[PDB]
Amino acid sequence: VGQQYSSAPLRTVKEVQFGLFSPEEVRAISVAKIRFPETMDETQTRAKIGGLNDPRLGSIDRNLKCQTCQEGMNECPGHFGHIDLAKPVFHVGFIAKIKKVCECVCMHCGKLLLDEHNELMRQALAIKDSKKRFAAIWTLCKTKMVCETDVPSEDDPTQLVSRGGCGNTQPTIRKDGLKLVGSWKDEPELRVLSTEEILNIFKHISVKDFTSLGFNEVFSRPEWMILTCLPVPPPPVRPSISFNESQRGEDDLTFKLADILKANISLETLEHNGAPHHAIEEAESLLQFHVATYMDNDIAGQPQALQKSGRPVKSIRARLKGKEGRIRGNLMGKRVDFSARTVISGDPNLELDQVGVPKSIAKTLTYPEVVTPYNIDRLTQLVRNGPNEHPGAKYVIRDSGDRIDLRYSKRAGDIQLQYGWKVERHIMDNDPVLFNRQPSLHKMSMMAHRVKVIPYSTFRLNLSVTSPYNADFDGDEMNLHVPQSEETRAELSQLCAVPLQIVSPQSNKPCMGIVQDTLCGIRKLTLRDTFIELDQVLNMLYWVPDWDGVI
Amino acid sequence: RLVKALEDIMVHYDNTTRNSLGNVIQFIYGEDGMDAAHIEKQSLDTIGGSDAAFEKRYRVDLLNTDHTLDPSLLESGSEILGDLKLQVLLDEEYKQLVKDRKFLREVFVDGEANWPLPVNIRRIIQNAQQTFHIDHTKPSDLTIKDIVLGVKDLQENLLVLRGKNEIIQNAQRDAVTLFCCLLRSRLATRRVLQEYRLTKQAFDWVLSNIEAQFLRSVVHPGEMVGVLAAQSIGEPATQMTLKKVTSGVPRLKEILNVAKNMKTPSLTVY
Amino acid sequence: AGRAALYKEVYNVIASDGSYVNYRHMALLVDVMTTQGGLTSVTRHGFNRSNTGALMRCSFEETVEILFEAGASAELDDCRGVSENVILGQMAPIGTGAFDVMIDEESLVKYM
Amino acid sequence: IFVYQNNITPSAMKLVPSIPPATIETFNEAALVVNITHHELVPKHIRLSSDEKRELLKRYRLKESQLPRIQRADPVALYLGLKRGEVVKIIRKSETSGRYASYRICM
Amino acid sequence: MFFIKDLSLNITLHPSFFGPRMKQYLKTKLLEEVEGSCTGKFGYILCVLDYDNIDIQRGRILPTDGSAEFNVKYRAVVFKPFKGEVVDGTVVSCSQHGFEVQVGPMKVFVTKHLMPQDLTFNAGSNPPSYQSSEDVITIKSRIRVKIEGCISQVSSIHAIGSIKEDYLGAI
Amino acid sequence: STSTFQTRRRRLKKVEEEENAATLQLGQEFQLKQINHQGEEEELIALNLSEARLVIKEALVERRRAFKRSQKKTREKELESIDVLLEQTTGGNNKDLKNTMQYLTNFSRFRDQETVGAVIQLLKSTGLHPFEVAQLGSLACDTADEAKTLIPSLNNKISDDELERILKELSNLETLY
Amino acid sequence: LRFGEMERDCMIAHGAASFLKERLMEASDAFRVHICGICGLMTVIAKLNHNQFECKGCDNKIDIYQIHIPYAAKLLFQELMAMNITPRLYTDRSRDF
Amino acid sequence: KAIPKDQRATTPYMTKYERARILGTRALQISMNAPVFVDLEGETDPLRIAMKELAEKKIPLVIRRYLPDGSFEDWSVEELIVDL
RNA sequence: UUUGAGGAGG
DNA sequence: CAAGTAG
DNA sequence: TACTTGGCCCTCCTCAT
């Protein structure tokens, strides 16, 4: 998939290691300095300034270039960029923990607030469950607010032993908007905790301290919950939308970057100029803002950071949030090709396991068959047949990874097939397909039928296979999926085939029977009172396709 | 939810129901390792019925003029009357059927004897019936040894688990126990010869089939049981189109959420 | 004895409707809810907090929030979860792919 | 084993885990008026020797975690007085196959 | 200096070749994709030893196309120069910047200023060469060099070597 | 590529790749302690010229053999006897091997798999590390200064007199031409 | 047509392993990307021509794999990364079990 | 780890998923121009040939059954009893 | 083209 | 509309 | 105390910025 051969080896993912970015790595990785906030126009001249999107990142305008990476548009995943902030910012989502962390370690020296010495502590440390240690470590010392320099060892509460020092009182902390404040207690002292400081108190936290608290020296050191260097997603993550040429189409994201960028430069241009000391932290909260917003936008501290037009603004997190979004809406469920839908109707002349497929669709849906000595003949006939008569095909693809469009190609009628080539042909009678009716809550809501090319526009299904999908013909529509690999088919025909689903495991009993007319009529036909004469008893016999020809 | 909550659960090649962590959730799928599809409501005759009827149906005494098998049924009838070494196997069979009795009446206090079990024995014999055109007139030809010794030999092959040790080979007897009771129930000498006049041939067949039909009723390591079970429950939930207590759809919600303040707290004390 | 209850109760919620569910299903659920230790709810509060992989519980309710604390605590995912693979585009260890298939070159000579 | 009537002083109770190896357990009168194990619903559980357990594991290829657990404060867990690590075999009736054997480790 | 390291390679075989003599095509293709290869991590892969007992193990079938993939465990003779190692070869080329000696499948170059002083360079010589008080180095003349450094590259490895030390030079 | 019998847990920070020098510090891929397919441990494989020339010819030849088990259904003199064995059992486009055989056949120091046997048995009573135990086998050496200088890793691992004797017994076994 | 979650759940029930994969990949997303053998990222600078590979910052050219995943997932990742979270992709397990 | 051909423990029979997948796989291959190990009594459909190759147990494939703990068991189409 | 709202279908 | 979870 | 996220599936229109 994708096209173009790669000498790289091919493996399947086996592990997913989650980590946090070390400002250093974000750099290493990046290919764009990303200094300007604007998009392109080298003074209106169309291209892209070595500023935002493409100062080497991916590209647009159907052009190979991509730091020689060429490949152009399709085949080239984006290439991350970075953007040196001016001052350290929180991380919308981690703030909660960055907070809890502090309540877990005092500043000035930055070290735990309960060593092997305290016993209640010990137990908390045995719990081999980062999630639960941290959740019990915190509970134990969110309370103690004095960096004890001496504690009664395992002997006499009389003899005092020493460890680390600087008892500097520990301030209780609370969350105000996007910042943390704490009092240091007659009467308190309220000062705002500067990122620049917090960060510093984390860098200093001990390696076995990371560890003791739910962390990991290699992939996630607390000192990374605070953003220094910012990863700048390449185009394919925030593409455009060009209404031809001389117009716009930038993606929502491409904006917050722009804003985060603006709000960054302005900050910096104050520390190397008339720096009105505490008239800066009034524009530093703007960077903390934007950079927070660009990721999360549905917060408690109201301000939604509305985009000109009052339109909310799509925070990255938004994209992933359940249903309709990435995870659930794109990966756990996608739209798919080789599918079709119409209105079902009953038909007492179709084996249980069949399905009437309207010629229309059969000519539309296709199956990729591999040119083989077994079929060459039959296949070449379908190919010559063109994509208009029914039994035919509509695409021939040769080993040379290039598709021949059967309806145009000046050689449409020509073509000798080559053992190995593939000929996408029409769906034919007896092509196993996965049929179904939503809502799907049964193994049975989906079953494999034998395709039956038929006239008129509907999926004509047998009656007895009705109740399983649980459907009637009152305008009820249905879905059909066409397999693609000899083995795919097999899977449908070998486990999804309707004749298999006859006995329901969800109630250890059959889940299909005889209903309506055939049911009603079978009773009438039964009755001792009911007798049938020759002429008819003969026609009836002829109808059971397996009649032994014995009146 | 039910679904997301059980996706990852499937029967593993060891015949254990685990998830993606491999945490055993059931040691044998459904406490019996049977594929739901191969199960039908059979009846455990060994349960219901007066202690009286129980004797007149399964008791065989070769040391008694009125409690021995009328030689009109067994070929070697008359020549068995009295044989002591047989009455030991005959007594063994009976002491068992009885143990079964007390066993079943200990797992199903209701007295309900109709339950879902693999291998439909009632039919598996019926077919044996007209398959060998068996005439209720002439006598069978099954040694008493033929029967009771073969029945024991069948149980040996109804393997659900395989294991080369005790813990496992012990679980075996467990996961099978119930079925067997139904087996001994239907293959008790008196029945086999007086109710369904099997011939050695018919018998050796009915046996051969139960064994094979059973081995087929076992669950397949792979079966994505969780989702199955999930659906199997949330499906009948949508079909819920709705003596005075919290009940139905809302009840189910109450249950899954593991709620503390159920509308109906109630409590039955006997 | 609790499992007994939980099940007995669930059963009755399907019985009151004249429906039938083969033990095993309700048992399995009653069991999943019980094993871990006591009553684990079929909610983002219970089951979706257990040791399961991140990507998995991530495809249900707490999504982004769940992920965040994953890279934060450098979580590691097995990719033994149906979901995991579905997200990855790899055949999941389910039925068909609950085992491997190989060409025994040896037997591949006795066949000629 | 100590049977209090209405309750013990929290000053008191904080003296049980202070003389190992030995061990102590506290039970309320009103909690022992009826033996719970006698209940229609409670199936019989059984302690497993450090051996019988090491066997079980090795016989299912199980890691300790993967085993269904029982609360250290679970009613029955005190009726037998388990310990964080001891495994219990629970043999109960089953409407699918007469008897089903399940195990419960202790947390 | 030369080695006999134990390696393994991965070949993905198309169903087509799932014949009777597969072991054959496998081995054979193994050879086409190893003998003549060069890695910085393994140096020069020169020859596959014990051709006959190459381990194939069972190959598994991938899962979208019948292709099967085998983890062929072999063993062979390799050779990768090092800094500080000393080997002697046959000079090949020679210029106003030095001469290049050829040690085995590789080629090591010697800078005019990395060799002794009393050794000038003769331009008007045919073939080109370097002259000394008593020594004369040209095309075929056999030298013995000390590899000062190595530079891996593509499907080959080069290195610069000095003959300014003692016990080095011609022979 | 071609995986090497040993999966090092490269946990992100792939930084520390020391230098390569006759300090006997060869890329981790050549620790004097490596692993054999059988899963056992096994000393590195020190192959000195002419000892290799034999090994190569050994398989290259025995290949020509098993190569025809499936076909039924003096200096300048060996330069030719080999150019043939190649154009039969080699990739032909392995111009590296051609050159390897020349170099390995011109500069080689032995002809008999016997003589080469003694070379080995002799040098293998040292306790010396494979690399040395090879450089010693393929490099002429008259004085111990010449040796312990053209193989600096020797220096303190053997008295000059000793290493001298050994050098004496080399030129003594050094097959003629 | 959309192959919603439910549809997936059914296929899982069936054990339609391969079919499911297929619906999800070949018949929709399916994309080929390159990873670093070191930091399980999509950094890799695959020039798929002059066979060049690299992935500086980790600096490679030798240890590089190629994988097939849903373009959506590709995105999922990149998106996560832009949020400063690293989803490592490793082609082999080291945690055993 | 690997499990001996002896001491083997799984089902002597073939799981439907195995059967299903092997016929699928084998079919894919036959359809890929792989070699066919039976006399096509004139058959021309791969999954049909696979069906035959499987009835004469002339399928060169081997099922590696993995266990929850990681160790597996290897079985050949030959061995595996094909009830169904 | 994306998006956001309303109406409808089983 | 609610219940639970968590600060 | 207060608030937070959960809210059938799929499909089809039209409208407006």
Ligand SMILES: [Mg+2]
């Ligand atoms: Mg309707």
Ligand SMILES: [Zn+2]
């Ligand atoms: Zn690019």
Ligand SMILES: [Zn+2]
């Ligand atoms: Zn301090």
Ligand SMILES: [Zn+2]
């Ligand atoms: Zn990298």
